[PDB]
Amino acid sequence: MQKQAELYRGKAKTVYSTENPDLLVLEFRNDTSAGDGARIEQFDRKGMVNNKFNYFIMSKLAEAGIPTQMERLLSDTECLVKKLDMVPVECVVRNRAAGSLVKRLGIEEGIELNPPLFDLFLKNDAMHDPMVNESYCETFGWVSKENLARMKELTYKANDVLKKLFDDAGLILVDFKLEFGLYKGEVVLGDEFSPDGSRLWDKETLEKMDKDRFRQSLGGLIEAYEAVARRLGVQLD
Amino acid sequence: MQKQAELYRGKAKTVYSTENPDLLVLEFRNDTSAGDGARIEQFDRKGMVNNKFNYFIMSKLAEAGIPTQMERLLSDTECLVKKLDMVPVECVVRNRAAGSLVKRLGIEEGIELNPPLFDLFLKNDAMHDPMVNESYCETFGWVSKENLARMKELTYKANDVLKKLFDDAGLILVDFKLEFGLYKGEVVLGDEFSPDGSRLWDKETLEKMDKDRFRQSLGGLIEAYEAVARRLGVQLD
Ligand SMILES: Nc1ncnc2c1ncn2[C@@H]1O[C@H](COP(=O)(O)OP(=O)(O)O)[C@@H](O)[C@H]1O
Ligand SMILES: Nc1ncnc2c1ncn2[C@@H]1O[C@H](COP(=O)(O)OP(=O)(O)O)[C@@H](O)[C@H]1O
Ligand SMILES: Nc1c(C(=O)O)ncn1[C@@H]1O[C@H](COP(=O)(O)O)[C@@H](O)[C@H]1O
Ligand SMILES: Nc1c(C(=O)O)ncn1[C@@H]1O[C@H](COP(=O)(O)O)[C@@H](O)[C@H]1O
Ligand SMILES: [Mg+2]
Ligand SMILES: [Mg+2]
Ligand SMILES: [Mg+2]
Ligand SMILES: [Mg+2]
Ligand SMILES: [Mg+2]
Ligand SMILES: [Mg+2]
């Protein structure tokens, strides 16, 4: 398997086609974004860390019964994945108050959410991923009621599986974002799951070990990403 | 039934208690708000026009089977209503793109929405009525899943009724907001329906005849309100 041509690139990854019409190659670059693309910086080892982090997590979700895009890793920064007809809606689950929920509602950061909250956001950098809801998906044809219901079911299952996984690693899964796509008509988990798209707090100290370190100028971004990778059991070198 | 004392005064109306623990007096003032209370201005006849406009609309909705708060008109600006345990969530139906939808999604104004959209906003002027969804209602306990579903059901029914009503009046019901409350356990329509909380365009010229005239300083605010009153056949004098 080899990259055929660059299809398109986002804020952090490059998507390539392959000789196989149903397979794509995803490249995790060192580009790290904030403000939905307004601020982007490069961190060495970032793409590699996230590529291996994503493989590990998706592997765990797949074992739990969650259908994923993953085929295999091709290098430190690339992975072969099924070509998915992506639903341009980001699925977010919040176990504790943080980020936009805090700014938006004025809720105290760290408050535990029971049951957890579920947010739907439209993928539109220009508009800073505006919040939408189920009626929006039907009215604008982003995804059917049945597929959306599947997306929510799978997102919540992922939450259950990962909360345990991170707790086992002395980490608190605060919130996270998932993106799904259709493969031959079925809902499949695509994109990625990494510290770029989730908030992870050390269980005993509450120290942030995710992209917030970049969003909020705390420094030590990659060091934190790698610390979490190591706690999970991932060998970086 | 008469006013006893002021319980509280909102951006546009004043609520009074009565000898009856289950009845309140709503007083529509001439106060007209924009920016969620940031900019307020007074217009003569405004309170009276909306008070009577509201009674008329509530009546039409009642005759359609929608349970409402309304008891009776008391004066040009006052009406008697059932005391409701208000749900702090604004319910919005959008038939055509306008206002915050256009602002949030960068979508074009006037675009027809099929089916119509349904937005839920937390009632909090301080935070500018932030958009929420059903999960927030469950987690923060603003309203039971059952009652919420009834709120949406009634709102959509109100839309079916009023679209017909306004269309016959040569007008386009672009969007609108409703507030519900609990009365002895049952979900009841409260607050008001007027040009203050709805968008109404002339079917032929698409001229805005609602509070956007105030929001956008287009002049002729009440003239437009009364024009709508006349097309509906609302007695004002
Ligand atoms: N398996 C897949 N098939 C097709 N597109 C995918 C797949 N997984 C992810 N994508 C898309 O590829 C892009 C990944 O690049 P990224 O830099 O994350 O983009 P963005 O700027 O939207 O965050 C996204 O648009 C994502 O939806
Ligand atoms: N039937 C009712 N019973 C109790 N409260 C009501 C009823 N109808 C409306 N209210 C509440 O009374 C207030 C009406 O006044 P208004 O000036 O519109 O207020 P606000 O500035 O809060 O929007 C609102 O807070 C509304 O929720
Ligand atoms: N990574 C992204 C993006 C994005 O990249 O557009 N949107 C949300 N998220 C992730 O979802 C959670 C909630 O994000 P917000 O608090 O900003 O809504 C966080 O873990 C975040 O990293
Ligand atoms: N009047 C209000 C309020 C309010 O007063 O807070 N919130 C929504 N609305 C009405 O709902 C529709 C959508 O409003 P937005 O476009 O602001 O979301 C409009 O008809 C508006 O007047
Ligand atoms: Mg992305
Ligand atoms: Mg995004
Ligand atoms: Mg986003
Ligand atoms: Mg009001
Ligand atoms: Mg409001
Ligand atoms: Mg509002």
Side-chain angles (χ1 to χ4, degrees), chain A residues 56-81:
Chain A
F56 181 76
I57 282 68
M58 290 211 153
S59 184
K60 289 288 177 173
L61 297 180
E63 297 178 359
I66 298 177
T68 79
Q69 79 197 331
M70 199 63 42
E71 290 301 315
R72 77 177 194 273
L73 291 192
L74 300 174
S75 73
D76 289 320
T77 63
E78 300 158 288
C79 63
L80 180 72
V81 304

Side-chain angles (χ1 to χ4, degrees), chain A residues 94 101 103-106 113-119 122 124 127 130-133 135-136 138-140 142, chain B residues 94 101 103-107 113-119 122 127 130-133 135-136 138-140 156:
Chain A
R94 305 173 184 276
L101 185 77
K103 286 291 190 176
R104 213 134 43 59
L105 298 185
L113 303 172
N114 298 294
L117 296 179
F118 195 105
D119 283 332
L122 171 67
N124 186 311
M127 300 312 288
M131 175 177 200
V132 299
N133 64 51
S135 66
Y136 285 54
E138 180 70 7
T139 295
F140 300 111
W142 297 328
Chain B
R94 300 182 189 275
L101 178 61
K103 189 186 185 185
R104 194 195 333 139
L105 305 203
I107 172 182
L113 307 162
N114 295 301
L117 296 173
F118 187 84
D119 282 331
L122 171 63
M127 299 305 285
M131 170 182 204
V132 302
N133 57 47
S135 69
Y136 291 35
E138 180 66 0
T139 297
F140 300 119
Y156 272 115

Side-chain angles (χ1 to χ4, degrees), chain B residues 169 193 225:
Chain B
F193 184 107
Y225 280 37

